[PDB]
A = this chain, B = another copy of it.
Amino acid sequence: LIVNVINGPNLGRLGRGTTHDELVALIEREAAELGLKAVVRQSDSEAQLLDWIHQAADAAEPVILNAGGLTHTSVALRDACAELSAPLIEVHISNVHAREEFRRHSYLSPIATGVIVGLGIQGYLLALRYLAEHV
């Protein structure tokens, strides 16, 4: 049943129109409809994100990860994610390919099962649906 949705730096600033609280609500509802339980967490702290990924590795739970700016910069986060035995879906709200060049490289994409970008907050819900149809 359990899927971890992990949001990295600055994702707490959503809607400052959907807020991060609203995003959690939307995800929890969709997960329930799909027969899943979503655990949604957000932090601006890389160490905190690492701890959540370590917990998902120890529990063999899937992860939907939007690492924010750390997507483009953190080898440490990639290394934690490499431990995951269940699926890892990378999600970005914006189309990172339509922006600055530095955003078009991800340390996570090569080790992710798959990647959804540019579909807004619905990307998280689509990632949930992938996991529901593959469990």
The chain A residues found within 8 Å of chain B, CB to CB, are 8-10, 12-13, 16, 43-48, 50-51, 54, 57-58, 68-80, 83, 89, 95, 97-98, 102-104, 106-107, 109-120, 122-123, 126, 129-130, 133-134
Cβ contacts under 8 Å, A16 to chain B: 57-58, 83
Is the pair B13, A54 in contact by a Cβ cutoff of 8 Å?
A: yes
Instruction: Give CA–CA (A74, B43) in the complex, Å.
Output: 16
Cβ contacts under 8 Å, A45 to chain B: 45-47
Cβ contacts under 8 Å, A104 to chain B: 109
Q: A46-B46, A98-B110 are in contact. List 11 more A-B contacts (CB 8 A).
A: A10-B50, A13-B54, A13-B83, A44-B51, A69-B78, A89-B119, A112-B118, A114-B117, A114-B120, A115-B117, A126-B130
